[PDB]
Design a protein around this ligand. Structure first.
Ligand SMILES: Nc1ccn([C@H]2C[C@H](O)[C@@H](COP(=O)(O)OP(=O)(O)OP(=O)(O)O)O2)c(=O)n1
Ligand SMILES: [Mn+2]
Ligand SMILES: [Mn+2]
Ligand SMILES: [Mn+2]
Length: 223
């Protein structure tokens, strides 16, 4: 799937890949969009980090720091006990607010390929509240609300498609994406590597929580 055009209010019930191909062409043509996808009850995981900052400068959110956030976020994903057996590639996408505005920053962690129930998403969001490392990481980034920056409604709110924004806001920009391989044959091995050539893919398509036809992002279905 369900797509909402915030600017027109029109909602669609999708053809999804062809839709995303058009949006990507619109996105690379700098078009102003306000498209959201409804997460529904079974789709990819999105984390909505609403950051209060100590300074008016955007946090550096370096790859090493974002990679550590991936590991911590995946730990809570793994701890949901919904992941399937075997070796699976899961992708973490960090879309960042373009600039800090009045000490308010934000980034989205997109795990679009990890299809899970909304209850599983909420349980992972709730589990993340107890992550002292995520809090320490964000605190060291200049975040003033590291214990309360993860929006508890991340599992519920419609997710802006990549390149789309809210009414008077700028669209979040993908800083980087990480490829995570989790193998039941080696649970302690969590290789998190930056995705090579993320820009060669349809970012609207790949980052969509409801998409199941992505090329880079292949659905991994949770229980
Ligand atoms: N009027 C609207 C429009 C969209 N959403 C959805 C779209 C985002 O994907 C999600 C995240 O919640 P935010 O309100 O924080 O949206 P952003 O993260 O994009 O904005 P900000 O940078 O201010 O945090 O909520 C919303 O809650 N309210
Ligand atoms: Mn937000
Ligand atoms: Mn809890
Ligand atoms: Mn929010």
């Amino acid at each position: 799937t369900n797509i909402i055009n915030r600017i027109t209010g029109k909602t669609y019930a999708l053809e999804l890949l062809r839709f995303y191909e058009h949006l990507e062409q619109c996105r690379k043509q700098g078009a102003l969009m306000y498209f959201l996808e409804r997460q529904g009850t079974y789709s990819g995981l999105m984390l909505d980090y609403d950051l209060k900052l100590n300074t008016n400068a955007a946090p550096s959110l370096e790859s090493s720091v974002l990679s550590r956030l991936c590991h911590r976020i995946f730990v809570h994903i793994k701890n949901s006990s919904v992941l399937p057996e075997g070796s699976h590639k899961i992708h973490f996408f960090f879309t960042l607010k373009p600039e800090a505005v009045q000490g308010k920053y934000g980034f989205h962690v997109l795990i679009p390929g990890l299809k899970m129930a909304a209850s599983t998403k909420k349980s992972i969001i709730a589990s993340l509240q107890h992550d002292a490392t995520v809090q320490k990481i964000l605190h060291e980034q200049g975040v003033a609300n590291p214990e309360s920056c993860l929006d508890p409604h991340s599992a519920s709110v419609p997710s802006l498609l990549y390149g789309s924004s809210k009414l008077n806001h700028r669209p979040y920009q993908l800083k980087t994406g990480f490829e995570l391989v989790f193998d039941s044959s080696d649970p302690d091995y969590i290789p998190i590597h930056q995705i090579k050539n993320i820009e060669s893919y349809n970012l609207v398509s790949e980052l969509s929580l409801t998409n199941e036809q992505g090329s880079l992002v292949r659905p991994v279905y949770c229980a």
